[PDB]
Write a protein that binds this DNA or RNA. Structure first.
Ligand SMILES: [Mg+2]
Ligand SMILES: [Mg+2]
Lengths: 219, 507, 107, 107, 51, 390, 254, 219
RNA sequence: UAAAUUAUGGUCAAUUGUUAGUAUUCAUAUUAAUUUUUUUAAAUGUUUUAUCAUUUUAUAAAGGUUUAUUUUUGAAAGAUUUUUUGUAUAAAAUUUUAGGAAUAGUUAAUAAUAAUUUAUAAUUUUGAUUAGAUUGUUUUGUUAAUGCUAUUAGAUGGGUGUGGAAAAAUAAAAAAAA
């Protein structure tokens, strides 16, 4: 295009802007929508092994990954061996259940986050003060809070056959590890990376030798 | 070397990139994990000289470094520069803030009339500070500020910060925790080539696989969640735990010869400033029990109990049976304030680890003193009573199947059986720790003393050589201290503990 | 929704997609036929694979034999090139007689 | 993320499910998790008005928008394709009853 | 010169430029053949080297 | 910093929020303490002070106002640093104690300069003389006092600066006790400003600090305040203020000259206020930022004669003694000379009785900016004209 | 286009379930190589800690339609040699296949019979091993094997293990890694506890005795007389071809 | 002394190859062109080669070079050359592909002038919003199709008349009446009746037979 | 059409060779001769190993002809860690013909690896495809010259799916695991 008509267009680009701020009336601050992902990354094509649905840098955490959680601790009747014999004690399993979850989902969260081979071994039932809980009801329908004492009464004659097809760290962004081995609430945020290797620059761009005249910085 | 963690930040700025807050957080955490605190403060000075206002996570990462260093001046400068306007969450406010900054875009007019320096967008970390302070991490700032004033010795400022933290955790709601960010790594989605060797791939030893941990853990973990996912009363319990941990850290810093394993006579007895320290710890524990009522029955107190036991083991020189009695009284007090018939919880592995460490500190000794071969013990040390109190405790832990044993739990038992002089620690190491654990070399650093007390010298020699073959077979290399222990008896045993290559290099 | 995002690098379409806005020109009948006949062939081919297994199996087996036995099945820089008659144009006269021309698009 | 795009059949399948999830909520409205769901519906409607649509898909779309109370961002092309559908020979009084009930529940 | 060459314009005469290229080719680019003044530093490193 | 839900404050919520009672509050000491807290900041303390949930034009006006406050406070910081440097230089060259430098004399300066020149130090004598000569004009403790008070009132007016003056960690200077102080000197100082200075918003807008709506409403409130203290029997209906003595004391708010002046139209003469004082008529006009509209804003001689004849028709005042005069005011602020000419012309007040009615007028030191030559030429050609007699 | 969605890096690969060289056949001794060290570590666990569902009173009665879905991967111990119905009994008499139970039969319960049960549909194996009590390991009273008559007593002593697997799978199928909890044995520490009368009979050794004599010297090193393969510290050979590290060479001819 | 860029290029060649250049490259040789074909019977239809043709993409005369100073360099700060471009939409006959005509400058130093050449690109628009006549701003991206490595980043000016013509059911732009011909022979349009097409066909085939008689040449 | 204002009370110059750099010989300079010089005749030993095998050893020429170019995650470097994981396969851009016209295993979409479908598809008079000539390269030469004139870095879809990568039928070193 003809570049000599640019700056005059810039004057019009001033005068269209200053009219637009003066003509219309702003009603109010519009809420910020969560930005999606673009499929137009630069360079060569990536593989499906590394397609993580994020091709830019966003340093902030938006609303779809934010969950409202309750630290629900659920008790189990266990038996320990002392010098006399068996003694009945209590083993506590703590989970982070969402506020809008049902009691069957709380039971599944206890199943997938106990990581103990002696606790969730048979079909158990959640109860509060002996009264059993309906698994098709929400936690808000029973008024269950962090201080609500929930017990798990087992029926040891049965055998719990579970199918852990859902990963332990499953959020809406669909990014889960295969060697995860721990609930995401228990693992630390930042740790040292032992699997990778530190690599330095071995390919010089323009400067190779004796006298740095220009360094070929245009390249 | 850890200096590269400072180097790759600097090359980030030479190559004209703006380092984000995650880079400063990762650099300070990596340099604090290697014990380089001045390099972490240099990372903080690099962040300040780039004119970057830090978020609350970067403030907390700096505050962890300056509570580990015990420098109150650094935290007071950081406080007066950044954290004077931090507030706790109110019941009227929304628990997450909305996203304030719309992403950077240009219209058809702003593309033309603006200059090229206004249309340029580098990822400046000062633009998204209010969107990184979205989740209200004020309590972990105030807890670290209460830690640094206790570490520096300021009681009034620590009392002010802890009183503000206590009133905020008793009268204000719990903020929404920040979810973890999985976009910080470039890991693949799945394993590209599924091939996994068996656990018994080697016919000589049991090895760990990528599918399952079959050798057992070497170090016990607390098995708790992060500090942000806690509730307010749980964060108050965690706050008391962290204040006691800083008490223990400053006690180990002030008296370094009385807190490690013996190496001198002064380890066995209490220092002069231990009783007021235990009085302050008991006053803090009773303040926690007075603030929280029956709600403390519905909270996880395993890390708090383990920290109480290590405070009353290292600072106050208590026996292991006294630690078990204090832990049982703590659990009965917690189970009794529920005002029901209830059922008490058991001690965890981290709670039993401090009881076994107290039992190992009872039987600990100063090896190879001035009398040339006589180990000096504690005054009034009874090996029979300590061993009888160790054995029923070990049977109590083994009766509970929900306590997962680890190598550091067996290490205190081996050191207790070595220090009691029962000559049965090697059989326990063979039966329980040898073939089915990833044991480090310091096990043998106890066991060589058990090898030293044999009748004939040839039994000592053959047991030392068999320990060296055990270091070869189970892939546990001999430490420098074990090789220096076998070095000192070369005139008697004549066991060579250095290679043929290292001596020719050394001379 | 007429301006792309400079920060995230999203296109003009993706910014309007994240705002719930629809900018689409009024299509002709062939342009609606292009977007309407995508599911019809899938519902035809899936019904063929469900209804005639003895013919779909033979077609898929012959297609796999033609794919597997090919000479240029090794992933290389020659096979990975987007425009083979334009990048490797000196082979079109004396070596490769498949493409009779070296220019098919604007490049 | 732009990996997939919803046609009118996926919207007509998702809207009764989201209305059934709205009726089971304690509040009358749905959670804030589904604001990206409805937005994914909101671009899917305004594009589908530029394509060809049968009468039954428009009826199911109007009944789905009336079931879970959501006004789309376009709202004018949908009324244009409802104006284009009332005088058809395919149109039944059941169809006009569904359309008028859905437009009264929306407007 | 294009790839790997720091020359940005012709030595003596050029086709007419506009905008920042007009300010660059006549005033602001490097020139080591200047016998009076070296190519100038960015601000404020030119005020203290005036003499 | 900025919170989700923070809003900018007007004067009513400022006097409602900081409504505390205090007795014998030191204005200069708390002013110096709050400014010492301000000068100890960095530029990063000025970044996140705009509330997010606002329209973009309001956010831009708030950003312009905060940048004006920041640059005026930085200019006063450099002036105060130069002041302390000159006081330290005089106390080091002379040898006098530092506390008595501000109460020294010119004969004492002559004696000290002659003593420094007698010993053979003409460089130090010239430095002492120049430091004292630039210290007599700047060295008072209340030098930009109304400007600094309006800056602190603007910092309270933003609404996001009130928490930035507390929760600091200090040391006791005598016992070295590290503590956290919760005393807010900004709140006490702005409470004393709110309680004592009843017209702090008028001085705040008159100095050119208000970027949102300007100083026009403050000018109207100032004029009706000065009319209610001179006519003393005042009724006010909407935009009309009238004295009921039979003698004509009328203030009429006609229109706003900023929104009414449409660019690109041919209509000569749009005024802001119309004041009839006895036999005199004044068309009080605030000038525009457009220099191509200032020639259109002033009315014609024929239009002024028509306004005077309309006054003769409606008030029954004889056309022998009727005088109408234009008045031009600066666009974005209001300097001292314009207020002096306003009190001379439209209220018929001298300097001493206006200082008796208005206490803060004596310390009002705003002058015309030198960057505007067109307004100064137009105001010189306008304010020096005789009263147009019909 | 369809060609320009991703690159050709990391394509879809054929799984190991359909490769004959990666699939372990049960008629070979390599089936009993992978599965025998998993039994000797499970019986070490069952004798030291109570495992919940390792010992039943009968065979688990799943329906015939749910038999192939639920049973593979499941293990339980029963008392006596009673085999499940709808299975063909194939006794393992091969000495190449029975040699991998050598540590299981010596250091733990004596292996009497190893049987492979193949059903009518040939899709669900069952590896039946008959042990004869008592255990050579000390059994805790709280352990699971204390609830077994054949394990606690010293026809009445026989008990059988049952391990259900699928016939032609890679050897990652026949893995039991949920039983690798390392529970301690308190047999050397039961002597010194309060429950024993031997607690006052042992004498502690707090100091080392005074050594008048040094250690016995080794016999005179005779160098070998055969042709050696070379330096094992640079042929990457482990210190005997068996174990150790190549950087720490020991136990060879020099 | 201040060395020029040729000293730095010679230094690079010496450090790479060990020596700068083998001398005596000119050789003053007389390149003789000998003719083989007939006078007007060269075997080509457009360009008939009858002289020594120089070979070289940038080492020929009159010399060209790319001129990097244009409207695009004035507006966009580019990470590399050709990253951002601004052009006009000329064709939307393909789905999700806008044909964008853009311009660049090529400089002739002999005549000291810059001339604007035109390059056509295929860009991607997913929601089908680009109409023929839009001033668009396109950016480089990954390979989308065989000839699509650009995408429409922004529509800087929409064609309102094209959208209003598409609302009317007409084409976006009325199609041109001129274009490319099919042969060098003058394409005559046939205006004949239903019955008079056979004699017109006979005249056309007789004209083709005369054009084939032109092969014989003389007589 | 402002109309000759009146101490003329300060004259005494310039040159001391120290310079902000394309400068022009229509007859002189570049080419071959009066002069060139000096050799070269193939038929060939890379090495370690566990021995009829296995481990390491990836750009020779002529021919055919190219608008352009580079970097392997895989082998090594390389470390008391470890997953054949450590972003290589892309873009802009610039060729010539004394007698100037058509081209296609074709363009885009795609639930489509391995396209039974859809489309008013794609290149080209701003010079395409083919045919001719043809490695390119501010490196050469000349001049006052942004002019004219030269070039020898290279690559190589059916020889073997081996190998990380075909570059593999031959190279005075690139010293190739004591
Ligand atoms: Mg390697
Ligand atoms: Mg189709």
């Amino acid at each position: 295009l003809k570049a000599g008509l640019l700056g005059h267009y810039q004057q019009e680009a001033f005068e269209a802007r200053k009219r637009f701020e003066e003509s219309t009336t702003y009603p109010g601050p519009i809420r910020a929508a969560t930005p999606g992902d673009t499929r137009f990354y630069s360079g060569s094509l990536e593989s499906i092994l590394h397609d993580t649905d994020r091709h830019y840098w966003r340093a902030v955490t938006d609303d779809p990954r934010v969950q409202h959680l309750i630290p629900l601790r659920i008790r189990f009747k266990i038996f320990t061996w002392v010098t006399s014999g068996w003694e009945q004690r209590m083993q506590v399993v703590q989970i982070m259940a969402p506020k809008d979850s049902t009691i069957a989902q709380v039971k599944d969260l206890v199943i997938v986050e106990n990581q103990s081979p002696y606790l969730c071994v048979s079909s158990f039932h959640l109860a509060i003060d002996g009264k059993e809980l309906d698994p098709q009801k929400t936690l808000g329908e029973y008024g269950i809070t962090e201080q609500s004492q929930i017990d798990a009464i087992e029926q040891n004659d049965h055998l719990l056959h579970r199918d852990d097809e859902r990963p332990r760290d499953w959020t809406v962004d669909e990014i889960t590890a295969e060697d995860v081995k721990r609930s995401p609430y228990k693992e630390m945020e930042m740790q040292p990376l032992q699997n990778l290797a530190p690599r330095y620059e071995a390919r010089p761009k323009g400067y190779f030798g004796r006298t740095y005249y220009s360094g070929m910085k245009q390249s | 070397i850890p200096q590269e963690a400072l180097h790759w930040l600097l090359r980030m700025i030479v190559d004209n990139f703006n380092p984000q807050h995650v880079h400063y957080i990762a650099a300070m955490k990596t340099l604090q994990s290697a014990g380089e605190l001045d390099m972490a403060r240099d990372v903080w000075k690099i962040m300040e000289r780039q004119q970057t206002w830090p978020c609350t996570a970067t403030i907390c990462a700096y505050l962890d470094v300056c509570v580990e260093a015990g420098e109150k001046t650094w935290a007071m400068e950081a406080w007066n520069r950044y954290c004077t306007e931090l507030k706790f969450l109110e019941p009227g406010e929304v628990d997450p803030k909305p996203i304030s900054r719309v992403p950077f875009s240009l219209t058809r007019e702003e593309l033309l009339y603006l200059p090229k320096w206004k249309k340029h967008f580098d990822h400046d970390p000062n633009l998204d500070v209010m969107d990184l302070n979205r989740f209200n991490r004020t309590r972990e700032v105030y807890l670290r500020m209460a830690q640094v004033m206790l570490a520096g010795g300021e009681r009034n400022a620590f009392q002010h910060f802890f009183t503000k933290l206590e009133e905020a955790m008793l009268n204000k709601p719990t903020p929404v925790p920040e979810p973890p960010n999985p976009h910080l790594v470039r890991r693949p989605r799945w394993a590209p080539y599924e091939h996994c060797k068996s656990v018994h791939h080697s016919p000589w030893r049991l090895q760990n696989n990528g599918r399952a941990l079959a050798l057992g853990p070497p170090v016990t973990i607390e098995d708790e969640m992060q500090s942000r996912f806690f509730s307010n009363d749980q964060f108050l319990v965690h706050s008391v735990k962290e204040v006691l941990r800083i008490v223990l850290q400053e006690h180990k810093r002030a008296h370094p010869t009385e807190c490690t394993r013996c190496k001198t006579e002064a380890f066995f007895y209490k220092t002069k400033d231990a009783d007021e320290t235990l009085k302050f710890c008991d006053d803090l524990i009773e303040r926690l029990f007075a603030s929280l009522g029956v709600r403390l029955s519905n909270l996880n107190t395993s890390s708090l109990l383990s920290t109480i036991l290590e405070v009353f083991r290292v600072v106050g020189k208590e026996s292991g049976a006294a630690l078990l009695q204090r832990a049982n009284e703590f659990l009965e007090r917690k189970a009794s304030l529920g005002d029901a018939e209830g059922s008490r919880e058991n001690l965890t592995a981290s709670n039993y680890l401090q009881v076994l460490s107290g039992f190992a500190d009872e039987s600990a000794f100063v090896y190879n003193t001035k009398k040339d071969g006589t180990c000096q013990y504690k005054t009034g040390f009874d090996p029979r009573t300590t061993m009888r109190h160790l054995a029923d405790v070990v049977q109590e832990i083994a009766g509970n199947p929900h306590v997962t044993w680890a190598a550091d739990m067996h290490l205190q038992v081996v050191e207790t059986m070595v220090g009691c002089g029962t000559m049965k620690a090697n059989d326990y190491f063979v039966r329980n720790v040898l073939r089915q654990f990833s044991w480090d070399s310091r096990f043998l650093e106890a066991l060589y003393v058990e090898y030293r007390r044999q009748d004939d010298v040839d039994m000592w020699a053959e047991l030392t050589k068999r320990a060296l073959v055990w270091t070869a077979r189970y892939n546990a290399p001999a430490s420098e201290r074990l090789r220096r222990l076998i070095e000192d008896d070369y005139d008697t045993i004549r066991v060579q503990t250095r290679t043929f290559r290292e001596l020719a290099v050394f001379q | 929704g007429l301006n792309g995002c400079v920060e995230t690098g999203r296109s003009r379409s993706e910014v309007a997609r994240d705002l719930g806005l629809s900018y689409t020109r009024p299509l002709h009948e062939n342009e609606k036929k292009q977007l309407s006949h995508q599911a019809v062939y899938y519902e035809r081919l899936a019904k063929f694979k469900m209804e005639q297994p003895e013919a779909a199996r033979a077609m898929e087996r012959e297609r796999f034999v033609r794919k597997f036995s090919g000479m240029f099945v090794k992933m290389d820089i020659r096979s990975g090139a987007p425009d083979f008659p334009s990048t490797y144009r000196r082979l079109l006269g004396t070596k490769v007689v498949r493409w009779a021309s070296k220019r098919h698009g604007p490049n | 993320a732009g990996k997939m795009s919803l046609t009118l059949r996926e919207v007509n399948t998702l809207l009764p499910l989201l209305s059934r999830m709205r009726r089971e909520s304690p509040n009358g409205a749905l959670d804030a998790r589904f604001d990206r769901v409805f937005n994914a519906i909101d671009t899917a409607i305004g594009a589908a008005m530029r394509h060809n649509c049968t009468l039954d898909e428009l009826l199911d779309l109007a009944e789905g928008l009336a079931a879970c109370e959501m006004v789309p961002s376009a709202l004018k092309q949908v009324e244009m394709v409802l104006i284009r559908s009332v005088m058809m020979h395919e149109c039944s009084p059941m169809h006009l009853r569904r359309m008028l009930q859905a437009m009264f529940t929306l407007m | 010169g294009g790839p790997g060459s720091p020359v940005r314009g012709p030595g003596y005469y050029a086709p007419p430029m506009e905008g920042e290229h007009q300010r660059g080719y006549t005033a602001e680019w490097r020139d080591l053949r200047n016998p009076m003044r070296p190519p100038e530093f960015p601000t404020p490193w030119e005020r203290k080297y005036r003499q | 910093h900025a919170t989700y839900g923070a809003v900018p404050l007007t004067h009513s919520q400022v006097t409602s929020v900081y409504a505390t009672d205090g007795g014998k509050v030191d204005e200069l000491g708390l002013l110096e303490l709050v400014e010492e807290r301000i000068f100890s900041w960095k530029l990063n303390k000025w970044e996140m002070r705009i509330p997010p949930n606002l329209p973009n034009d309001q956010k831009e006006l708030i950003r312009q106002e905060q940048e004006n406050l920041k640059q005026i406070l930085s200019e006063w910081r450099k002036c105060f640093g130069a002041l302390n440097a000159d006081i330290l230089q005089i106390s080091s060259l002379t040898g006098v104690p530092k506390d008595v430098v501000r109460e020294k004399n010119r004969t004492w300066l002559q004696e000290e300069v002659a003593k420094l020149r007698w010993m053979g130090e003409v460089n130090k004598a010239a430095l002492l003389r120049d430091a004292f000569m630039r210290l007599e004009a700047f060295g008072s403790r209340d030098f930009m006092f109304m400007e600094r008070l309006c800056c602190i009132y603007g910092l309270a007016r933003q609404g996001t600066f009130d928490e930035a003056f507390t929760n600091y960690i200090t040391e006791d200077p005598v016992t070295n006790d590290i503590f956290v102080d919760e005393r807010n000197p900004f709140k006490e100082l702005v409470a004393h400003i709110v309680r004592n200075y009843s017209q702090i918003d008028i001085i705040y807008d008159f100095l050119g600090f208000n970027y949102s709506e300007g100083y026009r409403s403050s000018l109207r409130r100032y004029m009706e305040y000065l009319q209610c203290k001179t006519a003393e029997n005042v009724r006010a209906s909407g935009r009309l203020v009238t004295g009921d003595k039979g003698e004509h004391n009328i203030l009429f708010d006609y229109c706003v000259s900023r929104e009414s002046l449409v660019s690109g139209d041919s209509c000569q003469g749009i005024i802001d206020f119309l004041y009839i004082n006895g036999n005199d008529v004044t068309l009080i006009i605030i000038a525009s930022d457009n220099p191509w509209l200032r020639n259109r804003q002033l009315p014609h001689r024929r239009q002024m004669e028509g306004i005077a004849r309309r006054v003769c028709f409606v008030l029954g005042i004889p056309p022998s003694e009727v005088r109408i005069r234009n008045l031009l005011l600066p666009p974005t602020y209001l300097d001292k000379g314009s207020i002096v000419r306003l009190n001379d012309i439209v209220f018929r007040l001298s300097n001493e009785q206006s200082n008796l009615l208005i206490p803060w007028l004596t310390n009002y030191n705003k002058e015309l900016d030198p960057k505007d030559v067109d307004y100064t030429a137009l105001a010189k050609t306008t304010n020096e004209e005789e009263w147009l007699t019909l | 286009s369809r060609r320009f969605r991703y690159n050709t890096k990391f394509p879809a690969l054929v799984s190991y379930n359909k490769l004959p060289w990666e699939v372990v056949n049960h008629e070979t001794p390599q089936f009993h190589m992978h599965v025998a060290p998993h039994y000797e570590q499970l019986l070490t666990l069952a004798a030291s800690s109570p495992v919940p569902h390792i010992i039943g009173s009968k065979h688990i009665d799943v329906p015939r339609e749910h038999r192939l879905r639920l049973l593979p991967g499941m293990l339980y111990l029963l008392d006596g040699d009673t085999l499940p119905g709808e299975f063909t009994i194939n006794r393992v008499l091969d000495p190449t296949a029975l040699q991998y139970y050598g540590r299981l039969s010596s250091q733990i319960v004596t292996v009497e019979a190893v049987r492979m049960l193949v059903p009518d549909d040939l899709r669900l194996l069952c590896n039946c091993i008959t042990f004869k009590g008592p255990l050579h390991l000390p059994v805790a009273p709280y352990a699971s094997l204390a609830s077994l008559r054949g394990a606690s007593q010293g026809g009445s002593n026989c008990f059988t293990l049952y391990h259900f697997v699928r016939p032609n799978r890679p050897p990652k199928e026949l893995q039991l890694e949920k039983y690798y909890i390392h529970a301690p044995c308190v047999a050397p520490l039961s002597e010194f506890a309060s429950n024993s009368d031997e607690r006052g009979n042992w004498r502690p050794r707090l100091q080392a005795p005074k050594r008048t004599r040094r250690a016995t010297p080794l016999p005179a090193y005779r160098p070998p007389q055969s042709y050696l393969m070379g330096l094992a510290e640079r042929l990457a050979v482990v210190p005997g071809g068996c174990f150790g590290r190549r950087s720490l060479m020991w136990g060879h001819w020099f | 002394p201040w060395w020029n860029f040729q000293t730095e290029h010679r230094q690079r060649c010496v450090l790479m190859y060990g020596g700068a250049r083998t001398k005596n490259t000119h050789n003053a040789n007389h390149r003789v062109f000998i003719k083989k074909y007939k006078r007007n019977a060269f075997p080509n239809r457009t360009r008939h080669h009858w002289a020594v043709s120089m070979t070289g993409v940038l080492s020929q005369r009159p010399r060209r070079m790319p001129w990097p100073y244009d409207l695009t360099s004035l507006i966009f700060n580019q990470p590399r050359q050709g990253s951002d471009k601004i052009g006009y939409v000329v064709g939307t006959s393909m789905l999700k592909t806008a044909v964008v005509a853009t311009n660049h400058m090529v400089y002739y130093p002999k005549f000291n002038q810059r001339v604007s050449r035109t390059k056509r690109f295929f860009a991607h628009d997913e929601d089908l919003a680009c109409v023929e006549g839009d001033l668009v701003h396109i950016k480089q991206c990954r390979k989308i199709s065989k000839y699509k490595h650009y995408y429409v980043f922004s529509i800087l000016e929409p064609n309102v008349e094209g959208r209003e013509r598409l609302k009317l059911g007409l084409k976006a732009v009325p199609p041109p009446l001129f274009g490319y011909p099919v042969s060098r022979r003058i394409v005559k349009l046939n205006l004949t009746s239903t019955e008079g097409t056979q004699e017109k066909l006979a005249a056309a085939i007789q004209e083709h037979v005369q054009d084939a008689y032109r092969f014989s040449g003389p007589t």
